[PDB]
Amino acid sequence: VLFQGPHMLEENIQEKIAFIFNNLSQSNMTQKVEELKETVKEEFMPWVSQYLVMKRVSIEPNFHSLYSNFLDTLKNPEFNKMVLNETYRNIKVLLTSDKAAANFSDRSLLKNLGHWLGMITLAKNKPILHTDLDVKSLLLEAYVKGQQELLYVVPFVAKVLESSIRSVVFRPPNPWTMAIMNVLAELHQEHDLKLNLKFEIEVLCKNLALDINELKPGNLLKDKDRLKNLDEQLS
């Protein structure tokens, strides 16, 4: 379904996969799950993964609970990792892309993918490995590159951390979750940071049932030695 070629029109595999996820509901879910297994070869699941993440998930955050339930009913761990790896691939296209304040779509895509990321990782009690994505280092990197990168990253990080509440492990006061919240707390009390991002962080705090003044900012934004030698995840 990515780069759909000439031979895939007659049978229209994308048009067939699309029939599964559109008009999907809690009512017809078990019917759609069995239909996916019945009408689509197991060899084609990578393409199904690509269609789900890219064509649906990235522009339908209202449907993420439904799609996450789809994965649950499907019970295909191999397909779940396809989706996860495909989720990381899409996140990186946006992270490594060239940023502007003028393009809103790319930021909404990045957020929705972040929200989805947390719903299939944190909320399912599975960690976001730093080999795939280093969240805390992402914030530190966004700080040195300027407001343009911060505008992309901060709401993105907020959307993935929102799922820690529905997690049994990643809820506060998880050392991993709180380590990130402390860096955001550090960014919050920076005269440089725009007001909307300061507001974004406060919204996130209450969304995690936290008092932003009970957080414990460190001195990571002043560690210029650590700031320069970051493994870059942005452009």
Residue numbers in the entry: -9 to 0, 1093 to 1317
What does the paper say about this structure?
The interaction between NOT1 and CAF1/POP2 connects the NOT module to the catalytic module and thus is central to the assembly of the CCR4–NOT complex. The structures reveal that the CAF1-binding domain of NOT1 adopts an MIF4G fold; thus, this domain was termed the NOT1 MIF4G domain. CAF1 (i.e. CNOT7) and POP2 (i.e. CNOT8) are one-domain proteins that adopt an RNase D-like fold.
As predicted, the isolated MIF4G domain of NOT1 adopts a typical MIF4G fold composed of five HEAT-like antiparallel pairs of α-helices arranged into a right-handed solenoid. The HEAT-like repeats are followed by a C-terminal extension that wraps around α-helices α9 and α7 in a structurally conserved manner, independent of crystal contacts. Similarly the MIF4G domain of NOT1 does not undergo conformational changes upon binding to CAF1. The most notable difference between the MIF4G domains of NOT1 and UPF2 is that the C-terminal extension of NOT1 is replaced by an additional helix (α-helix 11) in UPF2. Loop α3/α4 lies at the opposite side of the CAF1-binding site; the conservation of residues in this loop suggests that it may provide a binding site for an as-yet unidentified protein partner or other parts of NOT1.
